[PDB]
Design a protein around this ligand. Structure first.
Ligand SMILES: *[C@@H]1O[C@H](CO[C@@H]2O[C@@H](C)[C@@H](O)[C@@H](O)[C@@H]2O)[C@@H](O[C@@H]2O[C@H](CO)[C@@H](O[C@@H]3O[C@H](CO[C@H]4O[C@H](CO)[C@@H](O)[C@H](O)[C@@H]4O[C@@H]4O[C@H](CO)[C@@H](O)[C@H](O)[C@H]4NC(C)=O)[C@@H](O)[C@H](O[C@H]4O[C@H](CO)[C@@H](O)[C@H](O)[C@@H]4O[C@@H]4O[C@H](CO)[C@@H](O[C@@H]5O[C@H](CO)[C@H](O)[C@H](O)[C@H]5O)[C@H](O)[C@H]4NC(C)=O)[C@@H]3O)[C@H](O)[C@H]2NC(C)=O)[C@H](O)[C@H]1NC(C)=O
Ligand SMILES: *[C@@H]1O[C@H](CO[C@@H]2O[C@@H](C)[C@@H](O)[C@@H](O)[C@@H]2O)[C@@H](O[C@@H]2O[C@H](CO)[C@@H](O[C@@H]3O[C@H](CO[C@H]4O[C@H](CO)[C@@H](O)[C@H](O)[C@@H]4O[C@@H]4O[C@H](CO)[C@@H](O)[C@H](O)[C@H]4NC(C)=O)[C@@H](O)[C@H](O[C@H]4O[C@H](CO)[C@@H](O)[C@H](O)[C@@H]4O[C@@H]4O[C@H](CO)[C@@H](O[C@@H]5O[C@H](CO)[C@H](O)[C@H](O)[C@H]5O)[C@H](O)[C@H]4NC(C)=O)[C@@H]3O)[C@H](O)[C@H]2NC(C)=O)[C@H](O)[C@H]1NC(C)=O
Ligand SMILES: [Ca+2]
Ligand SMILES: [Ca+2]
Ligand SMILES: [Mn+2]
Ligand SMILES: [Mn+2]
Lengths: 46, 181, 159, 181, 46, 159
């Protein structure tokens, strides 16, 4: 099954010109395992 | 055209082309963010900073990302807290733990953060989650209370192939999480 | 005939409700007064999502550490952690586990490993046949009252 | 498959996705290594380390690189010293200046260096250059005295479009420097 | 005009698994300007 | 008639060969005894790759800094650096440049700016008409000998 979202986000207005991209999870007074198996990322600026 | 692209398949035990902060490390051919315990922060963000826009010409970037992550919890009735893909200022570090996914600090919009992220949350929070409990996906941006959140089934333990690509021309990001079927 | 009771030590207090977190003393898998009954009035706090998750698994986390003879110390290394069984008799069902069955399970309570011990409302007394110590133990009653061993007729879980 | 790729067109004044060491910096839309002076070292090496082979499976990598550099000297009869594309251990820093292009330290093979590089030298060195003076291109590997060097015309000041791609299957690198004509 | 070179270089044997790649020039008791105008680099490992 | 000579101060020594690096005093572009001749016997050390590189450009680096009236202080900001011309007369060809022409160029040698001054073997004397100072100057001769002003007949570069 698939779950999807689309939303108009004016990126330029919110996050800097130079940005590092990352994965981050957490655990509070409850938990679960969080693991990443692969990763792709291609970004072109005109 | 400026263009950076990387494709990681087996996060080896050494894994140099990334930055691990808080707990998080590689393991059996996999990147681990939180080792199923109480109160720990996990985050890893690739080493080279990428530039999205151009101040010199107000041009935003087109970008796509694809990844198969997994949230396997010991108990299918007590998950926590969340997994999120964030974009933030180069000099970025683990923000408030708990239910902030370690990227934000306030329910309220705090322009200063400069962080737009897509969050897959697995623990309802009265103070800022759609009051109906329902685990969900959402698009965060300088708050924690997203601007859009769509409820979704956990499938605790199954691999999940997701992919998200923003549109420079249309300033629109789309996130799709697909459980292999 | 004999009823079911929740036997505890003395030195601080709590009630059946507060159980979560504590270390328990058991007699052995499915041994009624040391499991079957206990798991019944605990089930509500187990958050046990039913099958195929072993109902043992649920109680395997809820209790910090214990001794449940006949428990897979390979998959649930915690239902056996308190087991006094030095050797291959650790968490054993045989009699090589000093805390196996009624008295043993109760003796698990005696050496401050466990805080609650589910052993028949007869054992403890038969066991500690000395006046003072007999007075040095409490008993959890279904209505969350810590009534004394002598009051087991009331302080009994199930019949 | 592991895959990293970047394409830089205008080295902006800030330029984060690189590391500048010694002198070197960005300028008028360009990366500068040495500002035409006496005795200075210049080097810049992209921020993310890439992994070439696999110890886990002795597999080497395929890689291509293309760039238009320029060596404009004040006098077409007194150039110095050289420009070189090097590959070396992550924790790498400016080695001996002068005629070593800041990557090596001995004419003699020093296994320890772990640096294979393609060098475009513009200053003959009796001690280790093909005795005939001739400026040239060469393939360095833990020495300075290449294993192969081919003489070439300077064209002082003209842009130069070069490109080099190694062969993983055939363990063969090829360097081509072409002056636009 | 073009100038080219081809040489069999057993990379694996010479440089580490993880390597940073870079540009470096120098100047001695003589000099010249060294400048880079662009850069491409795509590396795939099987 | 008058020959060409290389006029230097006194206080340490060197010869025409060692010129490279020093600061020179000139009279002005193409002024024979302050350029044409000098550039002739210097050419070999100029490494001047011919046209279209200005032969001025070559000597523009070879000399650390100088005063050459009529020199493009915009492209060769160094053939003018020593020029005593305070104001828009810096490196000027007019007489507003105190070191313009013979005496001026020689006076460039007098105020320790230049080390060699190419001014006619007449100037210096006419200039410093005082006994001691007349003895306080040397003259470079083609055969790399530092013969005195009085010996200019021999110590002359070209005729
Ligand atoms: C069996 O099942 C049941 C039921 O499960 C639930 O339902 C299922 C369907 C699932 O959805 C499952 O997720 C649900 O839990 C389990 O019972 C539940 O167990 C959870 C987990 O513990 C409880 O949730 C916790 O609640 C705590 C207390 O909440 C109250 O106090 C808060 C302030 O302290 C306040 O924010 C809350 O709103 C609430 O206050 C009021 O409460 C009343 C009554 O409920 C309401 O009427 C009011 O509306 C409400 N507000 C007001 C204004 O009145 C939370 O503390 C706890 O939060 C922590 O964990 C979650 C993630 O798990 C994070 O989101 C939080 O950020 C936080 O993380 C970190 O937690 C630790 C521990 O507190 C903190 O560290 C310590 O903090 C101390 C504070 O003094 C010290 O400072 C100490 O030094 C320090 O180390 C971190 O600081 C903190 N980090 C941050 C950034 O905050 C969590 O939300 C459920 O409440 C509970 N259900 C009920 C009805 O109680 C049962 O556990 C489960 N397991 C078993 C084995 O049986
Ligand atoms: C006009 O044109 C002419 C002709 O140009 C030449 O031809 C054209 C076609 C072009 O190819 C052009 O490139 C040619 O130059 C120019 O004249 C030439 O000018 C150059 C530039 O100065 C000279 O080359 C220099 O030679 C120096 C001296 O060489 C002798 O000593 C060396 C040891 O000290 C030794 O290694 C040499 O082999 C040589 O020794 C013997 O010499 C005799 C006679 O020549 C030979 O028969 C023997 O075979 C030979 N060996 C033996 C065993 O006998 C070099 O020092 C100097 O090297 C420096 O620069 C080059 C790059 O330009 C680098 O490769 C070097 O690494 C080195 O770089 C750094 O240099 C500085 C300055 O020395 C050092 O710093 C200082 O070092 C001091 C040493 O005590 C102090 O320690 C001080 O504190 C410190 O700061 C650095 O340490 C050093 N770095 C390193 C890593 O070493 C260079 O190679 C030509 O020799 C000269 N032609 C002739 C015939 O002399 C003319 O300049 C030009 N311009 C003008 C305005 O007219
Ligand atoms: Ca949440
Ligand atoms: Ca060289
Ligand atoms: Mn949320
Ligand atoms: Mn060479």
């Amino acid at each position: 099954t698939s779950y999807t979202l689309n939303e108009v986000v004016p990126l330029k207005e919110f996050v800097p010109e130079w940005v590092r991209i990352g994965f981050s999870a957490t655990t509070g007074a409850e938990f679960a395992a969080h693991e990443v198996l692969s990763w792709y990322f291609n970004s072109e600026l005109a | 055209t400026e263009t950076t692209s990387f494709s990681i398949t087996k996060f080896g035990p050494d894994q140099p082309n990334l930055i691990f902060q808080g707990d998080g490390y590689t393991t059996k051919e996999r990147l681990t963010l939180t080792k199923a315990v109480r109160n720990t922060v996990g985050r890893a963000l690739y080493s080279s900073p990428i530039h999205i826009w151009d101040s010199k010409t107000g041009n935003v970037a087109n970008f796509v990302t694809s990844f198969t992550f997994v949230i396997d919890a010991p108990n299918s009735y007590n998950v926590a807290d969340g997994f999120t893909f964030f974009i933030a200022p180069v000099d970025t570090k683990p923000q408030t733990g708990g239910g902030y996914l370690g990227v934000f600090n306030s329910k309220d919009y705090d322009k200063t953060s400069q962080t737009v992220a897509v969050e897959f949350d697995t623990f309802y929070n009265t103070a800022w989650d759609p009051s109906n409990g329902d685990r969900h996906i959402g698009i965060d941006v300088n708050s924690i209370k997203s601007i859009n959140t769509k409820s979704w089934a956990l499938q605790n333990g199954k691999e999940a192939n997701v992919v998200i690509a923003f549109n420079g021309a249309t300033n629109v990001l789309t996130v799709s999480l697909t459980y292999p079927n | 005939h004999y009823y079911a009771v929740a036997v505890v030590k003395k030195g601080g207090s709590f009630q059946l409700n507060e159980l979560q977190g504590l270390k328990s003393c058991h007699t052995g898998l499915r041994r009624t007064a040391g499991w079957n009954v206990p798991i019944g009035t605990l089930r509500p706090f187990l958050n046990w999502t039913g099958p195929p998750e072993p109902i043992e698994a649920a109680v395997a986390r809820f209790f910090s550490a214990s001794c449940v003879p006949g428990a897979d110390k390979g998959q649930f290394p915690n239902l056996c952690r308190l087991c006094a069984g030095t050797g291959e008799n650790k968490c054993a069902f045989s009699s090589q586990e000093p805390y196996f069955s009624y008295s043993g399970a109760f003796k698990c309570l005696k050496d401050g490993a466990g805080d609650v011990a589910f052993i028949r409302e007869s054992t403890v007394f038969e066991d500690l046949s000395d006046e003072a110590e007999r007075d040095e133990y409490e008993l959890l009653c279904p209505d969350n009252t810590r009534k004394p061993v002598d009051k087991f007729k009331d302080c009994h879980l199930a019949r």
